[PDB]
Amino acid sequence: NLSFTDQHIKFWKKIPKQKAYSTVEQYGQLLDYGRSQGAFVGEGVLPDTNDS
Amino acid sequence: NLSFTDQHIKFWKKIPKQKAYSTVEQYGQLLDYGRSQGAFVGEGVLPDTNDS
């Protein structure tokens, strides 16, 4: 044999493998913990709301 | 998760902390030990007054 063999494959044996159950695979990401809108409010004042 | 975690907070966990008993906290400072003058007086001469 003058060509490569099994031991020359590196990335295919290193990437983790997971089982698929459909032709479309979905996943969810978290991007932010909230909007940057200022944290100081004052004495006895209800602070504003925020959303991630 | 695509954002930071608790381990990325460094300064808040390092600065020393003390309890506060009021909305106004007071302290005192010593600026200098006296204004620059001449320290050599001469024989039998009353030295000048100085203050910090």
Side-chain angles (χ1 to χ4, degrees):
Chain A
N1 193 334
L2 308 195
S3 192
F4 60 90
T5 185
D6 205 348
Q7 65 183 357
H8 295 89
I9 306 297
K10 288 305 185 316
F11 192 27
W12 175 240
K13 284 188 283 187
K14 191 91 171 315
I15 187 163
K17 320 275 192 281
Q18 299 182 336
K19 182 175 174 66
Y21 293 104
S22 182
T23 46
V24 175
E25 294 294 328
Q26 294 179 34
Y27 54 103
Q29 300 174 324
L30 191 141
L31 302 171
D32 289 344
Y33 290 120
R35 216 163 38 242
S36 57
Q37 67 180 19
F40 303 92
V41 298
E43 208 192 321
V45 176
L46 169 75
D48 291 331
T49 64
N50 212 317
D51 295 290
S52 63
Chain B
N1 198 331
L2 271 67
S3 198
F4 52 92
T5 66
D6 202 289
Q7 296 294 321
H8 296 106
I9 306 290
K10 292 290 208 304
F11 192 27
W12 173 243
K13 303 206 248 185
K14 180 67 174 66
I15 170 170
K17 295 176 191 64
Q18 291 164 342
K19 182 173 175 13
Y21 304 98
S22 167
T23 47
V24 181
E25 302 271 335
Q26 292 183 318
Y27 60 97
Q29 302 177 319
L30 188 153
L31 265 51
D32 54 349
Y33 290 109
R35 50 185 182 281
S36 175
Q37 292 181 275
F40 293 100
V41 298
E43 186 174 343
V45 178
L46 173 64
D48 291 297
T49 65
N50 213 343
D51 62 358
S52 45

